[PDB]
Symmetry: C2
Subunit: 1069 residues, 2 copies
């Protein structure tokens, strides 16, 4: 290619031909380049020739329009680059907004940029962004690898490696203790292929910048995937052991007791050993991991061999903590066993590192132990400190005592008995799992436990019109518990006495509305709480009973049903009796009827205050302090919590300030001090280390001064009674589970009882699939709360709650695996009442125009009247997208693959035309019509021809293009199904985004802010702040209030339980 114009003097700013000499057919163009991607808007295009380099100014009249299109491409590319410089870690949806809202100069012939443009210019843009990374050189992550960029590279059929042009770190505010943990770990565990070959990077020979981007992306992508099932982890200390040679072993003193066996307090084994000392045992090599145990007891069996009982300890390395643990720290476990005194090697020193009298105010050699580790649930807890009675002062093993309680709690025992018939022994009450079951109480059971009274082909598609429909093809939630009232408990007999194993129950069946002939229509407006009575009867084993619940007659009530139903858990009600056969509803029979401390709370990374809100609902807290850097969130939080001091400064600074004696910040707000904060919650972001592969120099650096580290410092300084760290599920797998392991380690060094668990929001009454990692911690003194049992039955695929750490399976105390008391909350329940709006709705306050339809709706709107509906506002999508939405059908499951290949007038002059199918798809074949299905030369196996690339099509060119390798982009331009749920927590809904189905089920628009808020379980009264996307962001970052309440109510039990223990010990004092 040759060129011509007026060459000017390098300094000459003038773009007129004035002080210039004219050239023609200027030597073939070697290279062309660019520069200006950093400082100001100095994006200079430059040509390179074997003679010289030229910096282009302005183009000729005739060349203006050709250079015109070149210029747009470039400007967009600048925007993307500068944006990513400032916002790595940005998500697809963030660009699209960045681009869309960037106002281009009049210098550019275009009015504004759209998603369509970006897609049209994807190849150029991406290629440009790749170039910038070679060009300026950091150790920092290449821009082309940010999520937005990988999302684009995948969506747009971008091939990588096409080359071109060129031209103090965060310090976390730690505590002494915390710092050392992450410092020592760096000071310890730290150490140290197959490209694509085909790419233009790979075809180029310490010089090396031959890093394959196709590889680089796979890697980056792979690094965001985890491993979700493996057996329960084998118990420790069941290996062989080595026995030492007998010289002089003999009792010392007089027998402590006698039981066929006789116990002593002291033994000689060359030196002395006493009941309560600790010994070490050596196993059959295998690995050489020295075995320590506490000598529980000592005795001589009837056979005259000398025995001791060994309550094993657990090495820190062997707890979840693994490598991170103090090599000298040991943990108590429910592992003990009888041995011959012959197996002991040496007596060992084991010191109990108990907490101080003012452990709370304490923020900033030999074997020791601190906590009782439960292998299976991964709970570190405060040692039982039950004391030895004189009847077992000699035999005293905590492991044996726990296991005992645990065996008799599990045990099905009978409390009161009545008459007997045949071999059946009728009773009035019994127990299981720590629960008492008396006659006339009600009961939960699996769906299989009993039964009710039951009830009793497509035609061809116009493919010229719906060409992509062929792509449409290449388990659901359980039923909640059955509920019955107990009538007879007749048991069985094991000869002399009752058969505790064969306890049986005769029950009156209840129907739920949708067990009725109503079925799916019972379920809509109905209270999820409500049942119907039935004289239908059943018999099932006690074994199958899942729990007790409270079914009560509506009219037999001294309060409002609402009042009753909100009063506590597992409370149901009936008003009418169903009848299987007459299928009518009559009144029921006559035989069917008859303070809490709020913790003072600092919510770090508070957002608009969802987590705080669910904890407010539970009654267990009062958030007096919040820290949120992003003003709009802060603003919103304030609006919802007037009593809270809401700091908007960086938490690192606010901490340094308290650690310096400051009573107040700049604005003169009240800084919290030691003792103020009873509970500390928060969701620290995991910015530059949230990936699964091993730690690096790079990755650790980030995490070491992360907000996780800062948050843990808050916990160390303030030493709260309780603690909670919320985060995305995959928190527990980041960096080969080290982020979790170090977090736990740091909590243990501090001396906290702590644990972790994964929780599916949808299981607590929200129409959404979203799992969160939850890290609980409770101070010594309090009790470590449990994770809450699912209240809602939910799709098992969603509920993968387990967590593998160092190929060992760690599960939470949650027992409801699958079923639960209440039905699933649907998108319908979530938003079916809200008045119709249209694309681009902006009126914030509007009348409801109608009553609440679903239970759920009734609950988020309040048991009263409220006129205004706030934030039912949705994004003003481009006329193109708006058209697409309009053309997405309403049948459940419809998405872009249902679009018609049609011309459409796009409001204004613009006309979205048909997709041209000009290539063979060799994998996908022809249409029913014999038509081609390929959109790009890559469908044929060739490299992509560009300009074979279409834009502003109603069926987006780029979806067929990359379809086969991305699963047909199933769910893109997809409508939420009334019966379904939110694919995730939505922060900025984009139809070709990564946040799931976001179209409304019926309306040719995307979901509103309020609709999202409803997906999150926010009261309609709850307020948000700032422009629409700020609000969208707010809702979607939040922890859903119903999840927070659930967890909140588990803390309720620890408090109540821990308050009634100081009161049963104030009497004994």
């Amino acid at each position: 290619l040759y060129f011509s114009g007026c060459a000017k003097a390098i300094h000459d700013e003038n773009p007129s031909m004035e002080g210039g000499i004219n050239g023609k057919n200027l030597g073939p163009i070697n290279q062309w380049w660019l520069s200006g991607f950093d400082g100001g808007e100095k994006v200079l295009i430059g040509f390179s020739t074997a003679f010289a380099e030229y910096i282009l100014m302005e183009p000729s009249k005739e060349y203006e329009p050709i250079f015109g299109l070149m210029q747009e491409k470039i400007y967009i590319s600048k925007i993307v680059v500068e944006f990513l410089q400032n916002n790595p870690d940005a998500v697809y949806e963030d660009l699209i907004n960045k681009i869309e809202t960037t106002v281009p100069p009049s210098t550019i012939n275009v009015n504004r940029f759209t998603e369509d443009s970006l897609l049209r210019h994807a190849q150029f843009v991406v290629s440009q962004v790749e170039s910038y990374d070679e060009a300026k050189d950091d150790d920092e992550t290449p821009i082309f690898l940010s999520p937005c960029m990988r999302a684009l590279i995948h969506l747009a059929g971008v091939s990588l490696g096409q080359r071109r042009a060129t031209r103090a770190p965060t310090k976390a505010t730690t505590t002494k203790l915390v710092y050392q943990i992450f410092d020592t770990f760096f000071s310890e565990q730290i150490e140290k292929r197959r490209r694509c070959g085909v790419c233009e990077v790979c075809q180029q020979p310490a010089c090396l910048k031959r890093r394959c981007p196709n590889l680089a992306v796979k890697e980056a992508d792979d690094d965001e995937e985890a491993d979700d099932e493996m057996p329960s982890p084998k118990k420790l200390h069941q290996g062989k052991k080595k026995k030492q040679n007998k010289d002089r072993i003999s009792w010392l003193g007089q027998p402590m007791k006698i039981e066929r066996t006789y116990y002593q307090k002291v033994s000689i084994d060359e030196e002395m050993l006493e009941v309560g000392d600790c010994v070490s045992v050596i196993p059959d090599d295998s690995s050489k991991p020295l075995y320590l145990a506490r000598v529980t007891a000592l005795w001589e069996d009837k056979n005259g061999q000398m025995m001791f009982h060994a309550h094993w300890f657990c090495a820190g390395t062997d707890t979840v903590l693994g490598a991170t643990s103090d090599p000298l720290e040991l943990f108590l476990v429910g592992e003990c066993e009888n041995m011959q005194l012959s197996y002991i090697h040496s007596k060992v020193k084991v010191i109990y590192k108990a907490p101080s009298e003012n452990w709370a105010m304490e923020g900033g050699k030999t074997y020791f132990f601190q906590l009782w580790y439960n292998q299976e649930y991964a709970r570190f807890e405060s040692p039982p400190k039950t004391q030895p009675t004189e009847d077992n002062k000699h035999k005293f093993c905590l492991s044996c005592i726990r296991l005992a309680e645990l065996r008799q709690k599990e045990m099905p025992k009978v409390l009161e008995q009545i008459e007997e018939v045949d071999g059946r022994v009728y009773c009035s009450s019994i127990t299981k799992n720590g629960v008492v079951y008396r006659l006339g109480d009600s009961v939960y059971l699996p769906p299989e436990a009993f039964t009710f009274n039951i009830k009793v082909k497509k035609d061809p598609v116009n493919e010229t019109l719906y060409p992509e429909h062929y792509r449409k093809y290449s388990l659901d939630a359980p039923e909640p518990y059955r509920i019955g009232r107990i009538k007879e408990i007749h048991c069985g007999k094991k000869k002399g006495k009752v058969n505790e194993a064969d306890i049986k129950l005769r029950l009156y069946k209840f129907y739920r509305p949708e067990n009725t002939h109503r079925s799916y229509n019972g379920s809509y407006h109905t209270d999820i709480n409500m049942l119907y009575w039935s004289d239908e009867e059943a018999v099932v084993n006690f074994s199958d009973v899942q729990g007790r619940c409270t079914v009560e007659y509506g009219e037999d009530l001294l309060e409002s049903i609402q009042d009753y139903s909100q009063g506590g858990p597992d409370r149901f009600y009936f008003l009418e009796a169903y009848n299987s056969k007459t299928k009518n509803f009559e009144d029921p029979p006559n035989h069917a009827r008859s303070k809490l401390p709020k913790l003072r709370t600092l919510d770090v990374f508070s957002g608009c205050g969802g987590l705080s809100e669910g904890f407010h609902q539970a009654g267990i807290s009062e958030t007096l302090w919040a820290i949120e850097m992003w003003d709009p969130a802060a603003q919103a939080f304030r609006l919802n919590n007037p009593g809270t001091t809401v700091f908007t400064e960086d938490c690192n600074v606010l901490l340094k300030l308290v650690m310096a004696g400051e009573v107040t910040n700049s604005l003169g707000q009240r800084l919290p001090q030691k003792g103020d904060v009873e509970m500390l919650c928060g969701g620290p972001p995991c910015q530059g280390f949230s990936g699964m592969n091993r730690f690096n120099s790079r990755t650790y650096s980030k995490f070491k001064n992360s907000l996780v580290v800062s948050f843990l410092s808050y916990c160390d300084y303030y030493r709260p009674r309780f603690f909670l760290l919320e985060n995305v599920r995959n928190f527990v797998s980041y960096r080969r589970s080290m982020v979790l392991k170090l977090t736990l380690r740091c909590l243990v060094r501090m001396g906290y009882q702590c644990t972790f668990g994964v929780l599916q929001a949808g299981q607590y009454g929200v129409a959404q699939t979203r799992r969160r990692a939850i890290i609980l911690a409770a101070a010594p003194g309090e009790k470590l709360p449990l994770f809450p049992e699912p209240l809602h039955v939910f799709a098992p695929r969603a509920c993968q709650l387990s967590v593998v750490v160092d190929d060992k399976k760690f599960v939470s105390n949650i027992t409801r695996l699958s079923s639960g008391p209440f039905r699933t909350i649907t998108v319908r329940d979530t938003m079916s009442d809200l008045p119709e709006i249209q694309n681009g709705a902006s009126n914030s306050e509007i009348p409801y125009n109608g009553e609440p339809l679903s239970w759920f709706q009734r609950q988020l709107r309040g048991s009263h009247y409220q006129p205004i509906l706030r934030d039912h506002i949705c994004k003003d999508m481009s006329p193109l997208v708006a058209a697409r939405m309009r053309h997405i059908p309403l049948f459940p499951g419809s998405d872009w693959r249902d679009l018609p290949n049609i011309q459409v007038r796009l409001g204004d002059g613009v006309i979205a035309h048909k997709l041209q199918y000009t290539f063979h798809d060799v994998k996908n074949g022809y249409s029913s019509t014999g038509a081609l299905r390929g959109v790009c030369s890559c469908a044929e196996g060739k490299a992509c021809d560009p300009e074979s690339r279409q834009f502003s099509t109603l069926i987006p060119w780029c979806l067929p293009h990359a379809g086969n390798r991305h699963n047909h982009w199933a769910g893109l331009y997809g409508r939420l199904e009334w019966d379904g749920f939110f694919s995730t927590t939505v922060t900025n809904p984009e139809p070709m985004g990564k946040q799931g189905r976001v179209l409304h089920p019926e309306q040719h628009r995307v979901v509103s802010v309020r609709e999202c808020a409803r997906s999150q379980g926010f009261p309609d009264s709850y307020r948000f702040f700032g422009n629409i996307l700020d609000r969208h962001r707010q809702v979607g970052n939040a922890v859903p209030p119903p999840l927070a309440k659930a967890i909140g109510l588990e803390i309720k039990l620890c408090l109540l339980s821990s308050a009634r223990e100081s009161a049963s010990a104030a009497v004994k004092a």
Copy 2:
């Protein structure tokens, strides 16, 4: 923002001067964003309105 554009060499703190002072009077070498806090001897002339 504007000042920066005109003086690239300048460290432009946007925090409250009262806080930036308390920070130097406490030994801090840098602020939150990790910018370079000035210490005794750095500053030859001090202007302002």
